[PDB]
Design a binder for this molecule. Structure first.
Ligand SMILES: CCCCCCCCCCCCCCCCCC(=O)OC[C@H](COP(=O)([O-])OCC(O)COP(=O)([O-])OC[C@@H](COC(=O)CCCCCCCCCCCCCCCCC)OC(=O)CCCCCCCCCCCCCCCCC)OC(=O)CCCCCCCCCCCCCCCCC
Ligand SMILES: CC(C)=CCC/C(C)=C/CC/C(C)=C\CC/C(C)=C/CC/C(C)=C/CC/C(C)=C/CC/C(C)=C/CC/C(C)=C/CC/C(C)=C/CC1=C(C)C(=O)c2ccccc2C1=O
Ligand SMILES: CC(C)=CCC/C(C)=C/CC/C(C)=C\CC/C(C)=C/CC/C(C)=C/CC/C(C)=C/CC/C(C)=C\CC/C(C)=C/CC/C(C)=C/CC1=C(C)C(=O)c2ccccc2C1=O
Ligand SMILES: CCCCCCCCCCCCCCCC(=O)O[C@H](COC(=O)CCCCCCC[C@@H](C)CCCCCCCCC)COP(=O)(O)O[C@H]1[C@H](O)[C@H](O)[C@H](O)[C@@H](O)[C@@H]1O
Ligand SMILES: CCCCCCCCCCCCCCCC(=O)O[C@H](COC(=O)CCCCCCC[C@@H](C)CCCCCCCCC)COP(=O)(O)O[C@H]1[C@H](O)[C@H](O)[C@H](O)[C@@H](O)[C@@H]1O
Ligand SMILES: CCCCCCCCCCCCCCCC(=O)O[C@H](COC(=O)CCCCCCC[C@@H](C)CCCCCCCCC)COP(=O)(O)O[C@H]1[C@H](O)[C@H](O)[C@H](O)[C@@H](O)[C@@H]1O
Ligand SMILES: CCCCCCCCCCCCCCCC(=O)O[C@H](COC(=O)CCCCCCC[C@@H](C)CCCCCCCCC)COP(=O)(O)O[C@H]1[C@H](O)[C@H](O)[C@H](O)[C@@H](O)[C@@H]1O
Ligand SMILES: CCCCCCCCCCCCCCCC(=O)O[C@H](COC(=O)CCCCCCC[C@@H](C)CCCCCCCCC)COP(=O)(O)O[C@H]1[C@H](O)[C@H](O)[C@H](O)[C@@H](O)[C@@H]1O
Ligand code: HEM
Ligand code: HEM
Ligand code: FES
Ligand code: FES
Lengths: 535, 382, 98, 382
């Protein structure tokens, strides 16, 4: 009554619907097993956490700006005027059982979300997963990053703790007023009044439960549909031509490791949602516009923005009776970088000439100027971030505060040039380091030559050898070639027994002969498939 | 090569799996099990190893249930019998939660990496440029729904439907946006000149004529008399002190008609003013600016707290160097001359409030700011 | 906790601060801090501030390790090397490389 | 019968449409155009007719833009120059909106019903019981992912993963629900007996001992002294009057420590009590119930306003028949005897508050209700 009822309900599902065609198409789909192809899954797998916590945070949070005295449990805030957003965020922190944990693992899931989006953008950038067939997928993923950034900024500003209330005052109301023609108009449309306009926090709650995460969920749905139906890309390797995806199928293997990786991402978020404090809004105060911190720094995925405020050197213009302030520039500048980050595949489609349907990836050493432009962007992000904690860097690492913001202000101009030089020539030297492992072998320990005194490194060749001390030099194929005989089948047979006690020797012989024959069968089947493609 | 209808019940199960691969595009080359020799005890030991990980996951989930139900959490206030137990209530929650689902996940993926048979299934793609049937058939079907439905032959529907959807899209789009678009320059706030807009008006402005606007501090008392009237003898040499525009009308916080004319002061952005008391050995370093030479009071200066650009309160103040430093972007201002930006991302003089003493000797504002006090925007500086 | 100041100077941490040193710190402001006088802040208010800071730099961080006292930059740097490095390490233990 | 790769560029367009039908399952039998004879003017007249509907849609969308931007809406308060124009601001919005998109929609569907060629395309279904290949192939693939991955042969993983996911599901489910589950019977409110729970406690209960709980009315004044203390001479014969538990402590609404002990009375559900003054010709019809014979005051009765079942305020009162009628479900109560349900969906006596007069002659409550006053629930009546 456990397999018979499964067969009966399966024939019922096949009777009502006719799914088995469009289920077999799904659970025979192959995803490749490279590790970096899990990175964007983190941006999925934390995002579901952001719903599963976040829904829970919706049914306790009360947005308002109606000024209430606390009269609750938290003693250093009693009788103090606070917005009811902050009061019920304090109630999430201290009243409800396991409430501080759910809101902390929610904030940590937001950090892992907006950081894994950046890690995965680094993946699909430097591996070249964005040219011709997947450029719209880059565009909707880039827009998904923009919505992630703005929506998280609506997130930690949603209680008006004053560390983020001054973040609204800096970013969302100083830059918004600082836009030339229609700046004040979109400010007073966004707030409905002055800066503590009484319908800001509920408007952010409206945009932040549903209105931006509805668009984020729609773009993730269409995004994973573009990854799903239009097949996944892959690195080139042994049996990996342009028009096939090699790897594991969905049903026995990929579903198990994907669900287990969802569970381990949730484990990392839960461990660091418990063991590490985040946004301690009771240590912070209610937002009152006459008191600040010293840090006053945003969350890290937006620290490149007002760090760009912290580094742009006070250039204001004054036309005939008006004022362009500094905040126009970064309102241009954030509009600049996004217009380079959305529209990059069309930019280098124009520059390079990549008018070809690319499915195989390119290793990020194989494309040195694009990896170097990318490392310019990575190090420029790291500079604009690492000079946004300008304050606390100059605090702890004892530097003059003026000195470290000048270090940033020169660094955003000269350090992309330095990292472009180092990145371009480092990619070319990584190419040359695995283009001499083909013309020579793989390096090992030293033998001396017998009749005279020499020292050869005793290279182990990768392909066919000639009759003498040099092999037939292979051609490059976009693959990671192994540079250690370690990573080949050399000395990789320890005792199979236990960590403390050995198994009997016939069992060791059976296990190592069976595993050796299975690995031999793996490379034999992959090699004969590779010969079937060309032959 | 054929659907194989009658010979399919005789067909073996792995041959059906390879038939599904062939009918979908896949071939599962090298699908071999992980433990091909049976009865070995390394298989049994990795079996009980992944059992150890999953049993740790179950034990830590049961631990979550126990330390979530049965735990002395509550906000026990401070150092008292029961405060250290609350200090690790949420870390115990997260330890049990993350350890539970991380042990279950590492058990499931160790079951994948030790017992689920490894495969390299290669799937023949069909990506890019759909074949000659499908392209031209969809093109013919769409051009039959366009050419056969007799658009692009009726000019008057072809433009009137465009004018209809365009005019309705404009009306519906402005119906979306028209509830949002407020005029910032509608005169809202009452002022001595009349009704001025909000950006040219802090709470420091006079309402009818010269009225006593006391530079009152905020003694941070929970509700009862939060704004105490100020004398010059209170602040002393080398002292920042934050003053607010309190008045004789909105008195203590002991009436409900107050605490809304009184928290309005504490919530309005352009209200806080720092009251600088420069040490009088450093009064020869001061150089005032235009229209602003008598905005001191001896050595009392009143510079605003809201900074030049992007409106954070610049409540950092350095005596003995005399620099109003802001925290949000670290922009210094010179406290001596007038709050010109010494250094930072600001480019404008942070505004200065005039000071006199009242009858009975209390610090009052000698009018409004001469410039709009908050962050910059378009309509400024003429 | 500490905060940065203009040209090399910086606010120090208040954790290693005797309460009489806190009262006499705000009472006669040494370097770059305003001297919050006996008449600027009343001794009730100054005893009240040293009641706050000796039970804000002394009370434990409710709900985990206190990544400093100032929030989002240590929370970012402990997202990357503690959380995200562990996430990418799990992602490279699960998936292979080719 | 073949993919037709080379002869497809020569193939005509409607033959490609029929080829798409054949390759999908459809046949478009009878796809004939609506106007097969050309140059007729009935076609031209229906052309300009659907043009009239779409042009009306465009004109009404432009009308929406005009009467949305340029219209004297504002809440002009009452009868004044400009109140009738606001009285039809939203109807003009809806007239232009509904008329615009309804004219566009009736134009598009009249274009469908007059110019788009009618068809009866019959599509051959393939519904129900997928063929012998697909069923057994998916069954073999799923049983290869279950039997080949070597579950159902490892008992210890097969139960430890179940215990792991079950214990973690219990811990995570209680972590969802545990923030919600409050105990209603935790003693919260201070009472004369001590700390009682909230259901056994209205604001009519004494806090320490017999305290003067004045049966004050709510003169609906905006904030200043909303609760005026009550005398028996105020209410007269045959009169409902709503009293609230005001006290001498929480005085007028002119202090911020009041208006939160004072709006707490106006917001608490189980506070309102109607003060019945029965006409004294009808005092021989009254029969009190147990423990409640002295809960009158002469002819002053005090029955609660919150009804017997489902807690709506039963603020309808009928003199000369003496029935407390509730509005939400229309359940009468007998004002004479004790507020027993004469008729309705209630089955319990609506609670009665005891009355005395204070020193200085003011109506006060002579203690608490003898029964829990609000709607019914489990823990009641013993
Ligand atoms: C009359 C003429 C005028 C007068 C000239 C004077 C005459 C000569 C005087 C001598 C000059 C003084 C300096 C002497 C140093 C030269 C010595 C030297 O390099 O060694 C030779 C040799 C280099 O060979 P080479 O002679 O230079 O020629 C190589 C190629 O021909 C060249 O290589 P290439 O073709 O590949 O060029 C690469 C380079 C092109 O070369 C250049 O022209 C320089 C360009 C800039 C350089 C900046 C620094 C990078 C250089 C590396 C420095 C690393 C430190 O391109 C780049 O990599 C940078 C591109 C810049 C991109 C634009 C920046 C945009 C930033 C983003 C903008 C954002 C702003 C707003 C932000 C808002 C955001 C929205 O060095 C070596 O090989 C080994 C080095 C060993 C080091 C030992 C020294 C001690 C180290 C101690 C530790
Ligand atoms: C041609 C062919 C060869 C194709 C290749 C070339 C092609 C791809 C070139 C790309 C186009 C090029 C890069 C120029 C486009 C960039 C332009 C200048 C757009 C910038 C937008 C700008 C004009 C408007 C300013 C509005 C900004 C973006 C939003 C305002 C704004 C708002 C509303 C906030 O809420 C906010 C909150 C917190 C911080 C900041 C902001 C903020 O700046
Ligand atoms: C890939 C690249 C961005 C190319 C895009 C195309 C480019 C031309 C578009 C224009 C961009 C240019 C003009 C301006 C730069 C602005 C910038 C790109 C803003 C967009 C946001 C986003 C795309 C940022 C880039 C992606 C991000 C930096 C990738 C992460 C770095 C690497 C590759 C991932 C592995 C790192 C992981 C293993 C952890 C290692 C630990 C290290 C120390 C982490 C470094 C680190 C980081 C990255 C923090 O953000 C951070 C924040 C707060 C505190 C501390 C840290 C911190 O220590
Ligand atoms: C997302 C798409 C973006 C498209 C933007 C361009 C589309 C603009 C269409 C709107 C046209 C005007 C609609 C009617 C408006 C009108 O009549 O305009 C009067 C005076 O303005 C004017 O003529 C100037 C009109 C020029 C528009 C300038 C603003 C354009 C954009 C850039 C602003 C950004 C908006 C979207 C971003 C915000 C994001 C939100 C999440 C207001 O005087 P006021 O006295 O404040 O009356 C108040 C009632 O309006 C008001 O609703 C009512 O609430 C009362 O407050 C009342 O006071
Ligand atoms: C639909 C098109 C998209 C645009 C959307 C928004 C445009 C809406 C325009 C509707 C109003 C038109 C004028 C009447 C509204 C009005 O009177 O005010 C103006 C309020 O319009 C503004 O916000 C922005 C524009 C200001 C007028 C001119 C701006 C455009 C030109 C001049 C700039 C380009 C050339 C210069 C350099 C260009 C860039 C670099 C070269 C100017 O402010 P302001 O001049 O400070 O006057 C104060 C009183 O408000 C207040 O009562 C009173 O107290 C006064 O004291 C004063 O504060
Ligand atoms: C296992 C069973 C479950 C138990 C729960 C486990 C979870 C931990 C929470 C339990 C309570 C412990 C938190 C204590 C309470 C607490 O907040 O932790 C303070 C932070 O202090 C410090 O840092 C010193 C700590 C040094 C230890 C090692 C540092 C942690 C590292 C590993 C974090 C990595 C971050 C990423 C590195 C970035 C990479 C860079 C390349 C230390 O307090 P304390 O030392 O006594 O005094 C403070 C003064 O540090 C403080 O300067 C003073 O201002 C006051 O705050 C004072 O109270
Ligand atoms: C949708 C799935 C539905 C599944 C329902 C069944 C699952 C029940 C799991 C919950 C077990 C208990 C969780 C921990 C709770 C606990 O420890 O239980 C204490 C005393 O209860 C008890 O033993 C009785 C426990 C028996 C549970 C009875 C309730 C069961 C269901 C039917 C109730 C419906 C809930 C869902 C519907 C609501 C819809 C919402 C949209 C509370 O004393 P208290 O003093 O009020 O402490 C307060 C902190 O609890 C509190 O969080 C904190 O906020 C403080 O207020 C604090 O006062
Ligand atoms: C996990 C299982 C799912 C159940 C979820 C909820 C169960 C939670 C039980 C936890 C509490 C254990 C009881 C002891 C804790 C406790 O006392 O709280 C109880 C409040 O539990 C209740 O809500 C309902 C049960 C109460 C008694 C048991 C009910 C079931 C049995 C007795 C009847 C079934 C058969 C009867 C007829 C068949 C009907 C068929 C449907 C009874 O209060 P009560 O009895 O009204 O006494 C008042 C003090 O509260 C207050 O302080 C004080 O002022 C007192 O004066 C009084 O008002
Ligand atoms: C919330 C944000 C994101 C989510 C949920 C997400 C999700 C995913 C997933 C699950 C994959 C397949 C796994 C993999 O290939 O690594 C993927 C691939 C991809 N994503 Fe992301 N990602 C996000 C961010 C981004 C960004 C910022 C871009 C730009 C982008 C564009 C792409 C592209 C082009 C691919 C295909 C490349 C490939 O197959 O490796 N995504 N995305
Ligand atoms: C799209 C991905 C999301 C991100 C990056 C994100 C980010 C954040 C962040 C950083 C916070 C501040 C938490 C704190 O420090 O207390 C927050 C709060 C919140 N989140 Fe989200 N969120 C996301 C989606 C959602 C969704 C989908 C929901 C609800 C269905 C939600 C509900 C909430 C609520 C109500 C709050 C405010 C309560 C509080 O902050 O204590 N979030 N969010
Ligand atoms: S926010 Fe203080 S100057 Fe930029
Ligand atoms: S509504 Fe008053 S009795 Fe049910």
């Amino acid at each position: 009554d456990f397999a018979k009822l499964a067969a009966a309900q399966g024939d019922a599902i096949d009777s009502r619907y006719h799914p088995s065609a469009a289920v077999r198409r799904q659970l025979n789909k192959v995803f490749p097993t490279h590790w970096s192809f899990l990175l964007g899954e983190i941006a999925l797998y934390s995002f579901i956490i952001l719903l599963l916590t976040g829904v829970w945070l919706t049914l306790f949070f009360d947005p308002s700006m109606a000024h209430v005295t606390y009269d609750g449990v938290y003693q250093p805030l009693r009788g103090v005027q606070m917005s009811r957003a902050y009061e019920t965020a304090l109630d999430i922190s201290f009243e409800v059982r396991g409430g501080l944990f759910v809101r902390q693992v929610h904030h940590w899931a937001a950090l892992m979300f907006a950081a894994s989006i950046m890690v995965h953008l680094a993946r699909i950038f430097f591996t070249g997963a964005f040219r011709r067939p997947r450029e719209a997928n880059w565009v909707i993923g880039s827009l998904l990053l923009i919505l992630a950034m703005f929506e998280g900024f609506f997130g930690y500003s949603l209680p008006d703790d004053l560390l983020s209330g001054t973040g609204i005052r800096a970013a969302l109301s100083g830059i918004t007023m600082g836009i030339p023609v229609i700046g004040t108009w979109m400010h007073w449309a966004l707030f409905g009044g002055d800066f503590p306009g009484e319908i800001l926090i509920p408007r952010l709650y409206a945009l932040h439960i549903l209105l931006i995460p509805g668009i984020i969920l729609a773009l993730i749905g269409a995004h994973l549909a573009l990854v799903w139906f239009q097949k996944h890309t892959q690195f080139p390797g042994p049996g990996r031509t342009e028009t096939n995806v090699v790897g594991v199928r969905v049903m026995p293997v990929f579903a198990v490791k994907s669900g287990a990786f969802f569970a381990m991402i949730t484990g990392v978020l839960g461990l660091m949602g418990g063991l590490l404090t985040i946004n301690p809004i009771w240590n912070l105060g209610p937002y009152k516009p006459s008191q600040v911190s010293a840090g006053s720094q945003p969350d890290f995925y937006m620290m490149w923005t007002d760090g760009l405020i912290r580094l742009w050197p006070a250039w204001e213009f004054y036309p005939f009776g008006h004022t362009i302030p500094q905040g126009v520039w970064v309102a241009v500048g954030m509009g600049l970088v996004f217009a380079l980050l959305i529209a990059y595949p069309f930019i280098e489609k124009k520059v390079t000439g990549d008018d070809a349907h690319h499915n195989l990836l390119q290793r990020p050493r194989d494309v040195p100027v694009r990896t170097a432009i990318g490392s310019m962007a990575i190090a420029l992000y790291l500079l604009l971030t690492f000079a946004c904690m300008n304050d606390i860097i100059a605090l702890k690492f004892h530097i003059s505060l003026n000195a470290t913001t000048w270090i940033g202000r020169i660094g955003m101009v000269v350090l992309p040039a330095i990292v472009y030089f180092v990145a371009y020539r480092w990619a070319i030297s990584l190419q040359r380091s695995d283009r001499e492992v083909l013309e020579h072998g793989v390096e090992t320990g030293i033998i001396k030559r017998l009749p005279h005194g020499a020292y050869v490194e005793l290279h182990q060749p990768l392909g066919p050898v000639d009759e003498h001390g040099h092999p037939i030099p292979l051609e490059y194929a976009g693959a990671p070639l192994p540079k250690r005989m370690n990573k080949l089948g050399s000395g990789g047979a320890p005792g199979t027994g236990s960590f403390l006690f050995p198994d009997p020797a016939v069992e060791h012989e059976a296990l190592t002969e069976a595993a050796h024959a299975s690995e031999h069968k793996s490379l034999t089947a992959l090699k004969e498939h590779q010969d079937r493609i060309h032959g | 090569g054929q659907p194989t209808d009658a010979e399919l019940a005789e067909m073996s199960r792995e041959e059906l799996v390879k038939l599904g691969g062939k009918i979908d595009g896949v071939e599962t080359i090298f699908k071999e099990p992980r433990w091909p020799v049976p009865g070995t005890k390394a298989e049994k030991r990795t079996e009980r190893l992944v059992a150890y990980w999953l049993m740790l996951g179950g034990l830590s989930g049961l631990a979550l249930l126990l330390v979530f139900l049965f735990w002395p959490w509550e906000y026990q206030p401070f150092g008292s019998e029961g405060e250290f137990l609350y200090s690790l209530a949420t870390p115990l929650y997260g330890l049990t939660f993350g350890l539970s689902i991380l042990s279950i996940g590492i058990g499931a993926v160790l079951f994948q990496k030790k017992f689920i048979p490894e495969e390299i299934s290669v799937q023949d793609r069909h990506d890019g440029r759909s074949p000659e049937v499908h392209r031209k058939t969809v093109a013919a079907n769409l051009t039959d729904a366009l050419e056969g439905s007799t658009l692009k032959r009726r000019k008057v529907i072809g433009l009137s439907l465009g004018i209809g959807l365009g005019a309705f899209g404009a009306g519906t789009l402005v119906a979306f946006i028209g509830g949002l678009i407020k005029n910032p320059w509608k005169p809202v706030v009452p002022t001595a000149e009349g009704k001025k807009a909000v950006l040219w008006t802090s709470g420091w402005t006079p309402r009818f004529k010269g009225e006593t606007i006391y530079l009152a501090r905020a003694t941070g008392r929970p509700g009862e008399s939060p704004f105490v009237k100020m004398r010059p003898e209170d602040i002393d040499a080398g002292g920042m002190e934050t003053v607010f525009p309190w008045r004789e009308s909105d008195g203590d916080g002991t009436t409900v008609e107050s605490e809304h004319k009184l928290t309005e002061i504490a919530m309005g952005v352009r209200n806080p003013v720092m009251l600088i008391r420069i040490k009088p050995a450093d009064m020869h370093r001061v150089i005032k600016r235009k229209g602003q030479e008598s905005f001191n009071f001896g050595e009392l200066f009143a510079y605003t707290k809201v900074c030049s650009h992007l409106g954070c309160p610049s409540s950092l103040y350095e005596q003995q160097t005399y620099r109003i430093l802001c925290p949000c972007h670290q922009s210094q201002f010179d406290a001596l001359e007038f709050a010109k930006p010494i250094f930072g991302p600001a480019a404008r003089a942070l505004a200065q409030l005039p000071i006199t003493i009242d009858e009975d000797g209390y610090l009052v504002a000698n009018g409004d700011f001469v410039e709009p006090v908050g962050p910059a925007f378009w309509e400024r500086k003429s | 906790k500490g905060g940065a100041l203009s040209s090399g100077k910086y606010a120090p941490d208040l954790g290693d601060a005797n309460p009489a040193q806190i009262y006499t710190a705000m009472l006669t402001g040494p370097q770059n801090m305003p001297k919050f006088s006996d008449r600027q802040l009343t001794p009730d208010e100054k005893r009240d501030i040293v009641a706050y800071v000796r039970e804000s730099a002394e009370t434990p961080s409710y709900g985990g390790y206190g990544l400093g006292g100032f929030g989002p930059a240590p929370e970012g740097m402990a997202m990357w090397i503690i959380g995200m490095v562990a996430a990418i390490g799990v992602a490279m233990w699960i998936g292979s490389r080719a």
